[model samples]
Target: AAVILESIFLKRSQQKKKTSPLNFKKCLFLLTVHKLSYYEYDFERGRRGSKKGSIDVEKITCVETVVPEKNPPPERQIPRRGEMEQISIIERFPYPFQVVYDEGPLYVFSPTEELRKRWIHQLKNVIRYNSDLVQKYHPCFWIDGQYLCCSQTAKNAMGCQILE
Candidate 1:
């Protein structure tokens, strides 16, 4: 038996494109056996949350890093609903990565590039035996109704850049 890896990642749910209005939050990530689970973590008074963004290991179709924009349109602002204010990703979590699974692609940010690359390597190592890996992937983010990189309107559209 073998274990994979774990880290604290800021995740944004890509599936809430319609009306859910996804928000980025601090989550504790754990990858092992046949599961990859993420739960919210609090810095204030050392608190914990449940694993709401859990993905089965076998369901992972793609896992890759991303090229973040120098200026990421300030993720949180004005406390739109009942949450709180937001922080710009570039200002804090600089290194970003992605994990595409059965539902959709998930965008995650790491505290440092050191952690991000290693996390990518470990995930890629585990997913090497996956049956249905994609050939191409988006090099950038999916903004508004289309991908900012390739202008693809389809949420799960084929990427313009080949996966290498």
Candidate 2:
């Protein structure tokens, strides 16, 4: 009985270790409510409204695109780390921003100064939510001194360069 219990405990611990490395992280990009309506209502009025549901915390299927950056920003070359490289990845989310109507005449609210603050707050919240969803995963702009993404850099390395 003792051996059986110990084995079970060991098995459980091993299971956790194996699963801990794989995680689902939520990535959030913010746009105005108008963008949710396919940008058709971007500059329109919000005088009309509907019961379509306000932005609520929910998970929807989203597509993520990733690509390798070729000509990453230059850095002091280190012979040990290998070489400087850039990778650019652009992801168009399969899911889009949840829209919460602001005014009736305005189909969607344009981002005001106040709304910008809200966007930042919401962005942090989403990142936290996503991090908790995945285990042993953290956001990174660069990995191994190579830019893992194109966001920080204005240039998309993939467009003009090739990486070995």
Candidate 3:
């Protein structure tokens, strides 16, 4: 399932500390037992190349809460063009959690507290599941940090085992 953020701006890693606005439909944030996808849109086109930015479940380190309180960093501040009244409300409670991974750009969001909590919960579930699955089927090795990985499998009649 996907948690679609109808109104949100993404902060790229290169930006460091600015919310660059662009034309987009919505942030299609999807979560599965194995991956997390953040899909951007340009009205009718997805912006993450031809595919969404998918973070493998095994690589996601953790999700952390980032509230705009207690004097948060500049990047966590309300955007320069954001509505003051609306942003004020968002500043009151818990929001803008960070989705951290072992090998990619970071994802920060100011989703409602409930949505943020749900996302975190789902992520933790997958992380826990990965821990259990790894015990059952360990990986042979990691390729180029992120690539095909598996332990072993049965061979076909031709005595060849395909890598998936």
Candidate 4:
């Protein structure tokens, strides 16, 4: 029951839509032999808050980085006018990666590529031999109920290309 990896990550809301400026939260991620867990992290005080959520190791299907794109934020998911916000969050934590499971991809961001690489390397090792491991994954996320890269509507649709 030794720990494998631990770091702070900007976890995206299970929102199905990032257009919502409220979708991101900072958490202390703990990776162990049996589970990947995260808890609310109070930034200023540097304290761990209530347990938010955890993922079972066996259920992980894929672990990879999401290539960040330099594009404008999606304009119309419950679009409120004037002051735009989400893009700042994207820039603040530009390095992001995904932990996909049961057709749901959990996207988390790191402060730099260094940490992102560490998590990806460790996670890939941990899930290397999982049953039914994914060979492909959506490089871009789903926007407006569709995948940005492949236009796949089903959230669980097989990815367009092999994960690299």
Candidate 5:
């Protein structure tokens, strides 16, 4: 879903060679994403027809773990989930603000004027596909006074989803 900095590899030279002669000139960190699951729409297709595509949720599996080389290196998934690793700044936040997701017109926490404007633009784009944009509003939005950062307006929990 997201690429977190698991670790980095750096080769160092001996004292005789101040700069490690074993400098990593060209290193390629490769990542592959696979389709995991898809959503099924039972309702009739709209006028947009096939243009509108249902969301398919996918998770990253088979992640390759790399480690700095030793004559014999201990190898495994870099940092497996639940293992001791530094928690990311993003982990502290309740919701992902980077994604063009629907939150309130204003988030509960204070955001910069620029960020607020950008979020507004993002919200408008998210609703662009909906046929009834005006009448049918976003269920989840930032409500400062109410302390509602993220919510499901749809009465149905299934209607609301968070992208991994």
Candidate 6:
């Protein structure tokens, strides 16, 4: 019985040393009244101690799941230890999602199917609410590819250039 107890304790100790790396992180838009949040995870570094980042809840305009045309090589299944050459992977996930920002960087990450559906549902609600706010600020210019031309003709009209 004592030997069994000692073995059990050793197993538990070994399990305690192994910590699962952060797979995903929740993001929130603090600026709005109605709370909006999503889980953000990085597929770039599929190992522990990788740099972490998240997208602002409201700043994100669109989110969609995308699948790669081809699967990654079988050898690329395991991540290298310590460091590795940065390589762009395609079709690493069965259902990878993308988050587009109105004025910020686009973020692509993967979450579980349940979580992905939850985020898409919640974001729709946020988008509907934000649309109400947008109704107050009437658009004064028409976006014409590279330029925001004045849609309304007026004296001394100003136009701003749009960037890629």
> Between prediction 1 and prediction 3, which has the larger TM-score?
1
Cα lDDT for residue 38, model 1? 86
lDDT by residue for model 2 (1-164), tens: 01110000000011123225322121222233212211111213522233222232222111111231244222211122212122211111111111211211111111122333354344335444432222211122222323344333321122222222
Per-residue lDDT tens digits for candidate 5, residues 107-143, read: 1111122323443343344344544222222234322
Q: What TM-score do all the candidates reach, one by one?
A: 0.78, 0.20, 0.47, 0.79, 0.20, 0.34
Off by over 4 Å in 6: 1-54, 73-93, 103-105, 131-164
Once fitted onto the true fold, the runs of candidate 4 whose alpha carbons sit more than 4 angstroms away are: 16-22, 43-45, 72-91
Candidate scoring better on TM-score of 3 and 5: 3
Candidate 1 to truth, TM: 0.78
What Cα-based lDDT does every candidate model obtain?
Answer: 0.72, 0.22, 0.44, 0.75, 0.23, 0.30
Can you write out model 6's per-residue Cα lDDT over 15-103, one digit (the tens) per residue? 11124321222222111323332222333553223223334455654544433213333422323432212332222222334444543
Count of clashing residue pairs in every prediction: 0, 16, 1, 0, 4, 0
What ranking of all candidate models by lDDT puts the best one first? 4, 1, 3, 6, 5, 2
Worst 10 residues of 1 by lDDT: 76-85
Flag the better candidate by lDDT, 3 or 5.
Answer: 3
Q: Model 4, 1-164: lDDT tens per residue?
A: 78788777677786645455446776789898789999977767977778898898889998887766556234212122333254543345657788889847888877656678988888888888799798899888766677788998887789888955
> What's the C-alpha lDDT at position 160 in model 4?
85
Please list the residue runs of candidate 5 whose C-alpha ends up more than 4 Å from where it truly belongs after superposition. 1-110, 136-164
Residue 77 in model 3: lDDT? 50
**Model 3, span 65-155: residue lDDT tens:** 4434445455345443322346543333225554545443254554355556766676767787454222121112111222123322321
